[PDB]
């Protein structure tokens, strides 16, 4: 993918958003802003130019499940790709992600070599 693709990562704790940060900056993606729930990263979005969102599901204000099918209905965001990276791990949780249109999923706890997996998965899926 494009080392200049703009990320926004979702998650109303900061350690998470650290983590998934500096993960992306070893995968040479230096272009990452964040938010720490769905409404902040809905103000961040319609600033333009983001390329992907990496979001959790548990958070006040507007949880992931809701912002990841507010980005799906809205016709400025809908084809964004959305990697759900929650704690959540149960099926159903996982089905109704999926069926709201996530681009992939991981649960927390994960490695490093999973981000770089399920990230791959969706860019090859996407012919970023
Ligand atoms: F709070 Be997240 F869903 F791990
Ligand atoms: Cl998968
Ligand atoms: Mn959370």
Do not use: C, H
């Not at 272009?31 to 959790?56: H, M, P, R, T």
């Not at 006040?60 to 704690?87: F, W």
């Amino acid at each position: 993918a494009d080392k200049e693709l703009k990320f926004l990562v979702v998650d109303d704790q900061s350690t998470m958003r650290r983590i998934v940060r500096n993960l992306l900056k070893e995968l040479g993606f230096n272009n990452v802003e964040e938010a720490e729930d769905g409404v902040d990263a809905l103000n961040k979005l319609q600033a333009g130019g983001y390329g992907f969102v990496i979001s959790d599901w548990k958070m006040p204000n507007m949880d992931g499940l809701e912002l990841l099918k507010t980005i799906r209905a809205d016709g400025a965001m809908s084809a964004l790709p959305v990697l759900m990276v929650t704690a959540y791990a149960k099926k159903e949780n996982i089905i109704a992600a999926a069926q709201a249109g996530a681009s992939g999923y991981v649960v927390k706890p994960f490695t490093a070599a999973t981000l770089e997996e399920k990230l791959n998965k969706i860019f090859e899926k996407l012919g970023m």
